[PDB]
Design an enzyme around this catalytic site. Structure first.
Site, PDB file in Angstrom:
ATOM      1  N   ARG A  17     -97.021  39.638 -48.685  1.00 14.45           N
ATOM      2  CA  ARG A  17     -97.215  40.266 -47.357  1.00 14.45           C
ATOM      3  C   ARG A  17     -96.957  39.187 -46.282  1.00 14.45           C
ATOM      4  CG  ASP A 133    -106.922  32.243 -47.436  1.00 16.50           C
ATOM      5  OD1 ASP A 133    -107.755  32.658 -48.273  1.00 16.50           O
ATOM      6  OD2 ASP A 133    -105.756  32.666 -47.328  1.00 16.50           O
TER       7      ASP A 133
END
Ligand SMILES: COc1cc(-c2cncc(-c3ccc(C4CCN(C)CC4)cc3)c2C)cc(OC)c1OC
Ligand SMILES: COc1cc(-c2cncc(-c3ccc(C4CCN(C)CC4)cc3)c2C)cc(OC)c1OC
Ligand SMILES: COc1cc(-c2cncc(-c3ccc(C4CCN(C)CC4)cc3)c2C)cc(OC)c1OC
EC number: 2.7.11.30
Length: 283
Positions: A17, A133
């Site tokens: 994505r 992250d």
């Protein structure tokens, strides 16, 4: 003078994505080229803004080369160019490879080193940085057996994190968002899950665990935010420590370390500097 800006894109090494990563060639030298989707432009802007603020240079941070914005007919093309690590991500590496005590410790101490470098403010220097992250897909393996941390598209200086790796205070929305230390403690949680992923692949007494992602046994693939909250916050589950680790001094010490990254109370978790010190005293 001549400014040779052409990069030959040779092969796609990742597609998501986010966009795509290519192995590319500049002046005979490999580079990694991340081409951003329209969807994820703000990740390119945040990483570019950070590198425009502080040119991070550390053996355990993916090496920055360039940020490029090119006007197209109807669109803007955004590229991030970095050093290329042909061995790929730690996630990739752990699928087939097993580790011994030396390689396991070298991997996890290199990650702790990169993370402590992000987290620490240096005066005269760099601002403190939280990653937000951290996961095995955002760590690359180098030929020398150390790793480097990648992807500062969510980084904060003093898109949401991958849900599987979210700390309890992110899932229950109690995180003290006005406190920079909160974001460090979210990274430490994620570090502890990565440490669990790596430790599983360390052989002891002829035994190893198969590669599994954190919480593989209690959430679906592509777990929902709710799936994660019920496991981590409501039931307060933590990844399993296999009995076989308690026959090995290194895995016994690593089990204790990962436990001290997973406290429900974020302020009880170890710091990246304390994790390095603990890792330098193992073996
Ligand atoms: C614009 O864009 C791209 C440029 C390049 C690139 C190619 N050759 C040489 C250069 C270069 C570097 C630095 C200086 C310095 C010399 C000292 N002086 C006192 C200040 C200036 C000059 C030239 C660059 C920057 C590569 C690219 O691809 C990797 C570019 O696209 C992202
Ligand atoms: C972006 O990345 C790469 C860049 C280059 C590159 C190409 N031309 C010129 C340069 C340069 C020359 C000289 C200075 C000066 C600055 C001030 N003072 C006078 C001392 C030093 C700075 C920059 C560089 C760094 C080569 C690379 O690889 C071989 C790069 O990596 C892919
Ligand atoms: C996580 O994030 C980023 C990563 C990278 C990056 C840097 N070096 C190497 C890689 C890579 C190379 C090769 C393989 C495969 C292909 C061959 N074989 C079958 C197994 C290995 C995987 C991975 C990447 C993906 C660049 C980035 O930006 C430009 C990233 O984003 C910040």
């Amino acid at each position: 003078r001549t400014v040779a800006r052409d990069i030959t894109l040779l092969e796609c090494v990742g597609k998501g994505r986010y966009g795509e990563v290519w192995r590319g060639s500049w002046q005979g030298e490999n580079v990694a080229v991340k081409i951003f989707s329209s969807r994820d432009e703000k990740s390119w802007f945040r990483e570019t803004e950070l590198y425009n603020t502080v040119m991070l240079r550390h053996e355990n941070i993916l090496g920055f080369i360039a940020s490029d914005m090119t006007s197209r007919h109807s669109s803007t093309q955004l590229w991030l160019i970095t050093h290329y690590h042909e061995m790929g991500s730690l996630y990739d590496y752990l699928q087939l490879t097993t580790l011994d005590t030396v390689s396991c410790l070298r991997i996890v101490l290199s990650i702790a080193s990169g993370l402590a470098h992000l987290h620490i403010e240096i005066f005269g220097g760099k601002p403190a940085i939280a990653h937000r992250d951290l996961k095995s897909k955002n760590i690359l393996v180098k030929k020398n057996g150390q790793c480097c941390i990648a992807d500062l598209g969510l980084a904060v200086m003093h898109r949401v994190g991958t849900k599987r790796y979210m700390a309890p205070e992110v899932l229950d929305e109690t995180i003290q968002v006005d406190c920079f230390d909160s974001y460090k403690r979210v990274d430490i949680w994620a570090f502890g899950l990565v440490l669990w992923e790596v430790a599983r692949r360390m052989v002891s007494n002829g035994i190893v665990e198969d590669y599994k992602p954190p919480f593989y046994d209690v959430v679906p693939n592509d777990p929902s935010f709710e799936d994660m909250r019920k496991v981590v916050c409501v039931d307060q589950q933590r990844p399993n420590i296999p009995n076989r680790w308690f026959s090995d001094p290194t895995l016994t010490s690593l089990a204790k370390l990962m436990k001290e990254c997973w406290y429900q109370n974020p302020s009880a978790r170890l710091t990246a500097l304390r994790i390095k010190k603990t890792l330098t005293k193992i073996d």
